[PDB]
């Protein structure tokens, strides 16, 4: 049975590689504190305080907390991530299991200056999953508070909150309030455990590979085309130079002129920034020159935006202003961190199919030329979908997110999340957890006011998550060797992806998925 003196689960951290499948399992130790002193609170921000209109909000913070494993380093060790990206053309999630076990509730009393902590054996926690998607879904915004990448670390559970419609700092009639105690929930004492299972819906494999061809090079280099293009509008001669028409076939020496079947993907142009700072304009342009969208009178940066190549050839010092993912190095500051404290990703691989984020999409015609008027052209800085476009998605990273919830709407176009990962109409459900309030002694004459005098408590336990992943094997006939992700050979003060002398785990660099190649 389950009692005070027996454990309700075991520690599972493992990975198993079987054929076309890999199964990861992770266990961590968590600590859960009481939030808001058991209260729900209205929160808002408005111009009155001095915020700009672009930052206003209205919402609620709750006493509850939630579990989040939406980063890949929750499930994969760095060596496992190497096995995946060097050997496979793609992967996708299939199913998951979740367990919550070995739960301990503790009470802390304050007397004079000294603080003491004891067990409370009869207290509970409450847990439920939102399986019908009835709550605002705050997973998928890339918040802090996921399970730690390193299995020995103990993490704090984050507080749940949400936003609803606002006008300035005020609410409107359509604004919704939610009470989370209004769902069914399971209550657990120190001997109880909790578990559920979930199945992923069909989703396309993430493409982990780069193309070894480019979209404008798909032709046979040895042969002419049978089609023709207009090669000459004027006679080339001694003196006159009158109007003429002349035509040529496309061939090996004019590839720019040949007829083609396909177009590069869409473009929304970003401003370019150099990591060599003396090359930048001297001014503070991050917001005023930023790439933005405009919704209901608010301006919001398109960050990272649609997938575009970070730079062209030999340009690596440049990046789009708001167009890339940027991670932190360990102990990086929250505000105004220096360039040496952060890690910049590069989407450079998709340069074959996708326009570079800092250039125009192309050129079109402005006017109607004639004998009287010379022709004029114009530059295309944003281009939506054209028939014949092909494109790649943004890459995924070991530090980065896995899935997002597709918003429930009448229509969408190519619902792949812009921060990267798998779009899901029915994502893995969110998991809510709370300490049950325990009153301090009531008065001995009746009073109708709600009791707000409590014994301070927190809880701890273990959590397990297990995901099964499907693999897509690499079939290539390429003769020469591939690029692989590898560790450095040379000696160093510390080992990458390990602890230091102080005990702190760190991740030296971001690692994407695209190493193997494939024909376009």
């Amino acid at each position, epitope marked *: 049975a389950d009692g005070v003196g027996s454990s309700s689960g075991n520690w599972h951290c493992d990975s198993t590689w079987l054929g076309d499948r890999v199964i990861t399992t992770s266990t961590r130790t968590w600590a859960l504190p*009481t939030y808001n*002193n*058991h*209260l729900y609170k209205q929160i808002s921000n408005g111009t009155s305080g001095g915020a700009t209109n672009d930052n206003t909000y209205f919402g609620y913070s709750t006493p509850w907390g939630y579990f989040d494993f939406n980063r890949f380093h929750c499930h994969f060790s760095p060596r496992d991530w190497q096995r995946l990206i060097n050997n496979n053309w793609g992967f996708r999630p299939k199913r998951l299991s979740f367990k919550l076990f070995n739960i301990q509730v503790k*009470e*802390v*009393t*304050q007397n*004079e*200056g000294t*603080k003491t902590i004891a067990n409370n054996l009869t207290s509970t926690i409450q847990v439920f999953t939102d399986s019908e998607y009835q709550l605002p879904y705050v997973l998928g915004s890339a918040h802090q508070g996921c399970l730690p990448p390193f299995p020995a670390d103990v993490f704090m559970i984050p507080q749940y909150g949400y936003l609803t419609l606002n006008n300035g700092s005020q609410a409107v009639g359509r604004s919704s309030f939610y009470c989370l105690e209004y769902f069914p929930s399971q209550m657990l004492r120190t001997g109880n455990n909790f578990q559920f299972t979930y199945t992923f819906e069909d989703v396309p494999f993430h493409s982990s590979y780069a193309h070894s061809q480019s979209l404008d090079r798909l032709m046979n280099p040895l042969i002419d085309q049978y089609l023709y293009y207009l090669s000459r509008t004027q006679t080339t001669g001694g003196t006159a130079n009158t109007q003429t028409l002349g035509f040529s076939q496309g061939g090996p020496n004019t590839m720019a002129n040949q007829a083609k079947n396909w177009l590069p993907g869409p473009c929304y142009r970003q401003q370019r920034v150099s990591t060599t700072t003396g090359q930048n304009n001297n001014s503070n342009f991050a917001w005023t020159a930023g790439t933005k969208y405009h919704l209901n009178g608010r301006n919001s940066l398109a960050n990272p935006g649609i997938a575009m190549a970070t730079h062209k050839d030999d340009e690596e010092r440049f990046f789009p202003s708001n167009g890339i993912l940027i991670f932190g190095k360990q102990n990086a500051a929250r505000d105004n961190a220096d360039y040496s404290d952060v890690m910049l990703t590069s989407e450079e691989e998709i340069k074959t199919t996708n326009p570079v984020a800092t250039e125009e999409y192309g050129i079109v015609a402005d006017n109607l030329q004639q004998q009287n008027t010379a022709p004029q052209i114009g530059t295309v800085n944003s281009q939506g979908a054209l028939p014949g476009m092909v494109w790649q998605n943004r890459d995924v990273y070991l530090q980065g997110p896995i899935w997002a919830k597709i918003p429930h709407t009448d229509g969408n176009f190519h619902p792949s999340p812009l921060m990267g990962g798998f779009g899901l109409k029915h994502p893995p459900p969110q998991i809510l957890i709370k300490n049950t309030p325990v009153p*301090a*002694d*009531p*008065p001995t004459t009746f*009073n109708q*006011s709600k009791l*707000n*005098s*409590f*014994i*301070t408590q927190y809880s701890t336990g273990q959590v397990s998550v297990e995901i099964e992943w499907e693999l897509q094997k690499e079939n290539s006939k390429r003769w020469n060797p591939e690029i692989q992700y590898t560790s450095n050979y040379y000696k160093s003060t510390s080992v990458d992806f390990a602890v230091n002398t102080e005990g702190v785990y760190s991740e030296p660099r971001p690692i994407g998925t695209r190493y193997l190649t494939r024909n376009l």
Partner: nanobody
Amino acid sequence: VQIQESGGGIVQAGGSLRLSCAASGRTHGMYAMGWFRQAPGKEREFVAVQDITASNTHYSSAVKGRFTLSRDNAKNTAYLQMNNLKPEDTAVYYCAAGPTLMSGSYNSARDYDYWGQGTQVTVSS
């Protein structure tokens, strides 16, 4: 939701001084009412706190055995009576209020929403 100090003054050592505090509105607020003090050039220190029903009460170690905290819900006020005063009790006392009383966290300033202007109490020997 204004808290307001009263009863400030200067006293010789051993005298009995009485600080008072009042609020306006939200009797569904002001659940917990208490006192802090900040001496010259020093950190703010929690002095006392009591809840609405008078069931739960706490005094600071230095404060205990000399001060008593009392409360009148009708007037929506709270009083602090002070006995056997020592000149290290010169400080600026703040009435403080909050929606909740916790057993671990009550002595932290993080748990109080509202703060008065303060009072100056001087104690001489």
